[PDB]
Amino acid sequence: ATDRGSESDKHFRKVSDKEKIDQLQEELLHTQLKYQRILERLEKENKELRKLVLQKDDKGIHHRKLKKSLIDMYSEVLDVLSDYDASYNTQDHLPRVVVVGDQSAGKTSVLEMIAQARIFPRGSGEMMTRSPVKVTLSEGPHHVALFKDSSREFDLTKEEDLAALRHEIELRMRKNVKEGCTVSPETISLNVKGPGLQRMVLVDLPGVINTVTSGMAPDTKETIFSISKAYMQNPNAIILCIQDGSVDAERSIVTD
């Protein structure tokens, strides 16, 4: 048997079988048995195509006037331009409405009246917009909002969903800002539909300040304007200027 090839093969087979029942493999089996159940039982529900059919209806015949809205496709167009280039240059290629205003001028209330929903950060005597938020308005019988990055739809006729939407927007705004700073350029995309809405992409911008108030971080003054320029300079965009008309106009800065 010594120095025999077949005997060597048989010995190798035995040695490999013992390794096949090694503690590494045994622990792999034990952990795998739990893993087959962990992050599982979703699959059986997933097989259903009803959700897909609803998405098809949205894409194709939605049997409602809202279907195949051209502004709706423009929203996706601008989102994909943003995806192509973080840098402003290419985002400036295509038109949008960019809304700038004096800090605490009520600009979010204007954008809410235009959007016909309490979907913008609302507060008394405080910076409301700190990271720009682009909301696209399109006609539709269902007054609903949806984030680019989520699956939750917000009913814009009920306060619970409106407040959840506003505070989620606030949290996203904060998450776009580095620790210790207050203002950031990153744009939040929300697609809002409802009756009476016009075909209008609207970009809320960080409020501009003549000078920093003591409580606010100094950073913002240099940051805020730069961000505004990034979106304001778009040669294909409309500038919507929101100025506080209940104060001495000499103190305003947005018009500059």
204 labelled ligand-binding: yes
89 near another protein (CB under 8 A)? no
Q: Which is nearer to another protein, 97 or 144 (CB)?
A: 97
Q: Which is nearer to another protein, 110 or 200 (CB)?
A: 200
C-beta of residue 100 within 8 angstroms of C-beta of residue 206 = no
123 labelled ligand-binding: yes
60 labelled ligand-binding: no
241 near another protein (CB under 8 A)? no
56 near another protein (CB under 8 A)? no
- Using CB under 8 A as the binding rule, the residues of this chain from 176 to 215 that contact another protein are 199-200
Shortest distance (Å) from residue 85 CB to another protein? 8
87 labelled ligand-binding: no
Residue 180 corresponds to which tokens in the numbers above?
A: 């210790």
Q: Which is nearer to another protein, 71 or 144 (CB)?
A: 71
255 labelled ligand-binding: no
107 labelled ligand-binding: yes
238 near another protein (CB under 8 A)? yes
Of the candidates 104, 136, 105, 102, the residue with the CA atom closest to the CA atom of residue 119: 136
Residues 57, 79: Cα–Cα separation, whole Å: 22
154 near another protein (CB under 8 A)? no
Residues 235, 218: Cα–Cα separation, whole Å: 30
Number of residues that bind another protein (CB under 8 A): 19
Q: Where does this chain bind another protein (CB under 8 A)?
A: 68, 70-71, 73-74, 76-77, 80-81, 83-84, 93-95, 199-200, 236-238
